[model samples]
Target chain A: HHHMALISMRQLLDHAAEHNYGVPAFNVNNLEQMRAIMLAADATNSPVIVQASAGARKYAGAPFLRHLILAAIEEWPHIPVVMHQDHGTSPDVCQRSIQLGFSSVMMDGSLGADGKTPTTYDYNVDVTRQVVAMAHACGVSVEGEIGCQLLTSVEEAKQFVADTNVDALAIAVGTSHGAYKFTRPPTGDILAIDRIKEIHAALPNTHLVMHGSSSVPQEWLKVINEFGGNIGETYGVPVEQLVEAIKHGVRKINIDTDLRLASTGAIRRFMAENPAEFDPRKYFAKTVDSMKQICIDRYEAFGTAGNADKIRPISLEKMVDRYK
Target chain B: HHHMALISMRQLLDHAAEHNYGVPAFNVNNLEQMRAIMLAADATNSPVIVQASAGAPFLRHLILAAIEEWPHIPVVMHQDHGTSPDVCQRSIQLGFSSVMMDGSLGADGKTPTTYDYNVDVTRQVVAMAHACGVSVEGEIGCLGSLETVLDHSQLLTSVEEAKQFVADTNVDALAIAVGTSHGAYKFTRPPTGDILAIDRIKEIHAALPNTHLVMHGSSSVPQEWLKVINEFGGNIGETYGVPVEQLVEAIKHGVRKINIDTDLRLASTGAIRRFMAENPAEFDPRKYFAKTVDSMKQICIDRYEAFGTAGNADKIRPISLEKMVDRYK
Candidate 1:
């Protein structure tokens, strides 16, 4: 029996690649989000990949965030968890996260440390290689990106994976970041599903990641607007298209906006309905219930459900030997 | 140097009695309330007494995390108003440093209990608790009203019976039934001698000079918070709680622990209700919760300052359960 522990990203993604299911990498910032992830994963028996984005760390101090995740493992020891750092701008950033006990880190060499400026391919390779070298030594997995911020040519993606030896490679497949991925619901007209198939065929062993992939559900948007939220009508990558990408090689799907929308909508609704109820726990638990449904749906939709017990979890020490 | 751990109730109340001050025991249920308590204690350099009702076992981990996070602050993890010895045993096993064996009522906690039953149950709890170095607090009289219409002899604690109960049970602290009651509506008007009893507190203190005295339902429901809550569409009626001046006077007459929960609850409810009503677009719980902490923190600071709990953290040293075991023996 696998003891409750945070598993390496490499182990989780490797299993996903073999089983041909994609795992949703949800970003966690506070206790509500952390509890929602664990509850949803427990209910669905889904392995979890919870990431700490720059915004997440900024919102929750590093110590509190680390302990929140640790507390989850203590509460739910049966579920496999991955404490990952999302979008590290530099090798030093990844190293700090490693020291803070992250099981996986992403070196987003797609852009400079400023996170806004675009860098050359050589610059990307240089930073990604540096992070992989240090991270692999600590038995941590490295996810290197080619963009966020292309329809990926198989040639460029293959070379980047070969040069960096990254555990996972996040490639641009025409989806952009944030809530407004498209003005209209996207189809094959804009999303490059063929490009994902091309890269998966070329480098079949590499675990592929699709970022900026939040499927902003219109129902949640309507809930938000109905409860005093004045949000603009926007669209994100459809769930069906993401499912298609998973059939090829996409193993790690990053989603943030859908959870945010659900959270805002649920809290706004709860507050509107129970104006006299002042206990914060009453409304906070509603947000957990709302966010948990999104997670359960994503795990089932991405085929990440029912596989938490199948793959044996390995320790960091054992992973270090494999790296050697 | 004090190695931070959960100090026993006897140690905390002993320190309070020696220093001539009172510690406000705040009831903690959630993370916001726990963090607010710690932040206020840290800011004020005061020792903390955080309690959990029988319904709040989930609070154990939160208090443990707080202890790990703030090792410098002295904290007492107490179980509030445990109806029976069985309830107090569960709290002791769950790592609470102190337990209140509220034998004032039956195990159902609603029926008026006999003085003999109160001593028998409290004595059973004190025996088991002291073996584990856990402190036991015994209650004497039913905790309800201070109104003149109700028979004061039954509602108020008997001074002679309390002294004999402490001698029989050897309880570390005694929660005497004073004028204060639970909830925000403790008083319909400002409390005076007719409803609130300060003279009885002085009488009990004069009889039992060595025993630590506790005052339950001591939350001072500030009208300011009530104003904010009603302004933001809440329907709480005009009500009041134990006044701060009366609490300070009680401390002078040997009150060592003042339990404050409703005041913090009102502050948090008011702060969040106001925030949510004004900023309709903001939905992050953290944003509203931060305001609650600030509002609750102010109330805690006021209590710590008024009861002379501030600037006393450094005076008391940490005593381990093993040492307390010997002291109990």
Candidate 2:
């Protein structure tokens, strides 16, 4: 059998919308992370959305990151994968990713080019539209983020999608990035399920996304604390609520830290338990297993499990034609 | 600029023997170890010998990544502890420049085998490996301590048997059973000749001067790393490994390639454990994995200088596998 080519985000998200499933976009920086995501996706029969963040690009240079994902695709040809560029701060950034063979690029124009200042809606639309034009020409899908004073209004989302024409739009409800997403478990007011439903109702054709969606797995948190980690009490969006968001409109869920927490907890516990063990691979092997379990959990919870085979991956050539 | 091809073990060890140095062969299973070895070798202007643990295409690519990144440095992509001819053949097929057919133990890799069994298996691997211009390393004795076996002295490679084994197998290199064993617990106390068997290494080298000698389980197991590991919640028992001085002594007596895994493993664990303990709030793996690279790189640089492996890469001329095929024939 021929190796499966990576599918575009537009193609994948369209399928997700049709099937009523959500894909978790996992950020990868190294081999273990790539292997874990692919392994879990393979086991659960889930289509994968592996993303590379700005920090990831800095940590593992573009060439290395390209080869890492390429290796995963080659190794697991049975699985449908999307190589997405996460949080590309500008058109130029997204352009480089598109040139580097990303199936999808997230042009995060929510911030200015400096990445610290918020941009006007006009500027956000301009930059994202520029990226979408370049990305679509090369059969690469673009994901645009709406600057949320922590929440996207239904009108702004409607106009942003209409103007930018992104394959996916990451809207901010209440969840934020990293391990400390919430000090306490999130409630409806903090996490905006109603907003997601409203956005879905307004832009029924657009694929809505949720960023910083790691559940921050309390059991993993407890494990970290048990194994000498000094992590403060924190929480992430609950899986049940994330499922609720998926039910409403969210098709792509960005998950980065849940895997990180599991990996850290597993490493600390492995080091503590096997005091004499020093092989780095042994420690990293434990991380792969731990992170894979989290990936498996998200796939199952998000109703992504058993949906990989259902996705007949369309090639970039066909995607280019679709863009035409 | 051309990407340097991985050099054959025979070519590298011949240079080491001529130059009177030993190349420390570090075992790699992932990207970090490969990167660290290449970085250290590049900094020290030393050649590299990175082996796989009977491992993947991922591993093959990882080694290729090192070669691509450091084109100026000479590397020997070798397979460590291949238990049979099939394993050695697969390694050759995977484009390894060298492989070790560890026939000292049976196919199970633990049960002791007869000298005739060792000779037959080794000869089979050598015939297949040499046909493809890949160098074959054959072992003549088991590598373990006195605590494991009833007759510890019998585990040491007999000088006479080594000479005969080389003659029968036509191996490119020979791994002799010196006092050094695998892992962090190679010694209960600082090893002396009573257990280290440096004299035995001399006898074997004297017996087979034409054959390149290899020292397996030769990590110094740095006390500093052990201390760091213990300081950072590791409960490693008080143990010792072959001292660098003894290894230098072995190198003088014809040890060309020193196989080391434990020392690098120790440094990595120590570096990571310490990093995690100190930066309790940080969870990014790159931050801690970078520390391991630094720590492991220092060990690589130290060994390169200690074994006189520094500044010798340019001395050896590159030889292709196809060229080696004619040479073998």
Candidate 3:
């Protein structure tokens, strides 16, 4: 009965490639975030990966965070969902995540041992190889980073799929981390779709992953800053550029900052507008609803709508068999 | 040292009578409560019994709650501070308390069995409990009544105490301090000289033979509460209390039903005062401080255990046929 339901990442990527669309990888922390992601996916019929970061793990606590995702999966049993760890820095963190039941892990070796320097090519290769070896053993896929695609990287971005056996490669192509990715109306230092094209051509089978891709809408930022908030003059990747990046080769477009900014901005605006409100639920509900809308918009804009029906189900039994 | 330190009801009673005072059985729930009770008892030179009621048992969730009150001396660790048959009935519902450390089992069985049969059945359970060296509180004390006392006449158990109050009641520790009770401002009706009779306790202790004794009303009427009530334009009179000196004397005389209720109330009020004074406009209950309750409980515990009652819990015994007797008329 469960065989026909719930699509896997492999199938979702295949379908996205066929349809020339992108699957949105939404970062979630708690129940509200999970609900927003699920609602967006359901509304758009987008294959969504609800990724959690290490900060999310520490904040929500692992047991609760895992159950939050599990509850989401249980609620939307037929939805194409990938519970991925967004930027797991170490083998221990990645392995622990897989054990606690994440479906995929992004072994981010971009940050060196100091967690600031760009990792050496050999270091990235070693970590990626180890992660791939372990993750595949458990039938869980792995995402690897090849190049320091920040505004500074001039080296020919390594084709992660051809260089190392990674299922997805997050090649940084001038996008900065966080909501302040660009300033003064995105002077085209955003995701260079040309770089995505080169990487996609090098490794057509491997999924093209884009990080720091949230379109922090100017209206929401302006509203927040106006309503007693101090969000400085900042901009994120333009929605057009993000859509263009997806069109070129980005299959897994990470959208965290957009949801965060929208939710925070909505909450700030609502609270400022209504000073008498003491209850947190009133503001949080609106924030979550706004986040859900942002997710829905992303799902539609990235052209990932109606892609859930094509994904393949990855069963625990199959994973165990592979491990054995 | 550990063996000699175990306290039974008879011992508490004997200690109270011999020393001319009573053992204060403070109701405890959490770790802070236990610490407070011990610290207070130690400071005031009074023996203490940290009693756990059925509601408290339910609140603590059995195992986790029991662990909270363990490893204290001069503490008659007790259960069955229940008010009614239903409350008592639930005590026996979870069979874990009978086997619980340093406390008494309930009279009813876990099943829908007769009281007599349940008592008989629990004899084996009690033996196991005793073999494990934990005391059990078997029945409601004779002063058991449903009413939260507001008057002096409500404190009516002396007649029953004279008739049925013995080691034969099967209670390793007995809660008996007349006119004194649980909860706030126990002398709420009118201040009378109806103090706990040290002589009566002497007689009971003489009969009980090394059984531990317990008291319920041992709160020092907080001048702060009186002050607060007066400041708030409420009328609370100059109600006197069993002072620490008096409690110290009571411990020396062996009147061990020295329960401390008002002190914890005072601790809570004092904490609230400090909090309000510190964070003048902070309205959030969580933000201000929930540790007030904990601070109050610790005060009660510290006083009880330190006053020559620490490690006395081990001496309590489970129910036995020899101790089981008919209710005093």
Candidate 4:
């Protein structure tokens, strides 16, 4: 019965809060990503948060994306999954995700109507609170965001947490979105490990989210360049910084670019190495293996492995009842 | 009624029989392939018949869900080259619209089988299928070893045997083996008329005009796709498939359903191989996956136009299996 429903993220993050472990939420663009995340979770005995970003929903039709999740639950019913809408730009978008049955949705009104434009402190609070009101009524978890560490003042973040009451807060430290996050490596100033401690110290109950958290493992970048790719020089959050982030209540660590690098690098190497491999499955098999290993590493790194049993998974139906 | 249902294959092939054309039945092993088939049929405004050799339960869920996803399309869920009544019955339970009972060879699909064994098994499946209003596809004459056969006589379907097989089995569709075998390595060159047994197709069709004839191993393995594979480090050497003209000639005679599996394999493999070779940094599967579907969709469009399934979507409305059971009476 638990496996049949796409479970809510509320219970898992609650368990993370109680257990003091970090849950690495992976971004899913398609079936291979979905399959890889689930396979790794199953193999490692981890609870998973498979978040579909806005770009993913636009590229794959909305119903198809929903059906893909449904099929995952249909086949691997034993694994508890969180069908999370990653970056909802407004309450309107978050409401649509709630109606479509995602277990969680993010409303980052910190960015204005244009989604890239930063807004006033009160404007961010107004929209995030609005989304929390609607999402809480539907039993869907709410994740709110401040544009970045630079954007939110301590007074603004403290009130934002108190006013919106979001279950998760995505506050950018140093990591931005993309493979090229930094032009050159920085010391602790730009990496901003202290900003996380500051935010967590203020709102210890609110879970913190780190975006662009991929380490961009140098080996994968080298694989890309060797196989005819010309990626520029880049760096990501050090694993130790993430360990420190988790210690300061950063429960959900978003890993997108790292997955992109691993998958692209594996496929590039597979094609270049197995010159005669024409069967898509054969090549895809290697890609899945590579992505699975990356996920297993993150699961282990974030201390998410062997934690599915950490909390009893709450089904979608019961979650609605709780909201009621 | 629900938004989705499997349409009867017999009905579509019967329509093709009356209209004097052929419908291509493409094989699908995964989601991309199934989506390619359905999306192509949607774009081309053509009826679709998607067949599977095995992997019934797993593949059936995808097909049934795709039907729900695109209710406007009329699709036939057929089991390709089924070896036994046990497999056929299970496929029917899995919501197949039609099934092929390929008893010409043994269950291993290799050893030569007797007429009595073929008849007994095919008849068993036909009874089981027709009761559920699901159509049964039966085959006579082994579909194998085209080049090894001494002459056309050794491989072509005997007209007398086809008549007796059809009359006894009461099959809705009969795949009478002429010369086409399986795979892209079908022939060294485009087959000649003598070895292809175009005349034999005519004889079987002339004798059993009502029985819809099906052709398997009929991929026109394009020289370009093969070259694409080879240039990308593929080892599939010089090989050939039945030419379009030969199939067109057969369609004119009585072939209403063409079972194609290899051309798609070549097209997608070529598309992905070329895609990976070209865009090394691209990690998203959708980029190459789109190419895979697009290239295969073009093949579907080509076959629809070539086989005369194009421009005929509006000609027939799909009937659910419940209604088909009534028609069976």
Order of models, best TM-score first: 2, 4, 1, 3
Candidate 2 residue pairs that clash: none
Docking model 1 quality class: acceptable
Residue by residue across A1-324, what tens digits does model 2's lDDT show? Answer: 343578898988888888888889899887898999999999999989999988777666566677677678778888889999998888999888988889999888899888778889999999999999998888899899996577789899998888988889999898888989887788887887888889899988899888899888888888888888888988898899989888877899999888888888899999998987887888898999999999998999888999888877778877888878
lDDT of 3 by residue, A1-324 (tens): 343222345556667778998877887765557778887888887777888876767644565566555556666666767788878787777899888887788888777645567887778887887788888787777888867735323243444455666777787777766776766776544446676766666656667788878777888877766754456777777778778776777788887777767765665566456543323345557866998999888888888887776666667447546444
Ranking by DockQ: 2, 4, 1, 3
Using lDDT, rank the candidates from best to worst. 2, 1, 4, 3
- Candidate 4, residue B196: CA error in Å? 3.0
For model 1 chain B, the run of ten residues with the poorest summed lDDT: B55-64
Model 1: fraction of native contacts: 0.18
Q: Write the per-residue lDDT of candidate 1 for residues A1-324, one digit (tens) a residue.
A: 664567999999988988889999998876778889989999999999999997666555565667677777777878899999999999999999999899999999999999989889999999999999999998899999886535667788889998998999998877877777888778787888988988989998999998989998999888978877766767999899999999999999999888888887886787678766656677778989999999999999999999988878899778999789
**Candidate number with greatest TM-score:** 2
Interface RMSD (Å), every candidate = 3.4, 1.9, 13.0, 3.2
Taking the candidates in order, what DockQ does each have?
Answer: 0.35, 0.49, 0.05, 0.39
Query: Over the stretch B1-329, how does candidate 4's per-residue lDDT look in tens digits?
Result: 01337778889988897787899889876667777888888887788898877522336556665666677778888888788889889878777889999888778876767899999999998888888889988888877646774344536789999999998888888888888887777877668866578888988888987788888878888889989988865667777888888899899888988888788888888987787777765756677877888899889888898888887777888776778777767
Candidate lDDT (C-alpha), each: 0.85, 0.85, 0.57, 0.80
TM-score on B-chain, cand. 4: 0.94
Q: Candidate 2, residues B102-197: lDDT per residue as tens digits?
A: 988888888878889999999888888888889999888788885556367556778888888888998999988866688889889888887888
Task: Give the DockQ-based CAPRI class for model 4.
Answer: acceptable
Which is better, 2 or 3, measured by DockQ?
Answer: 2
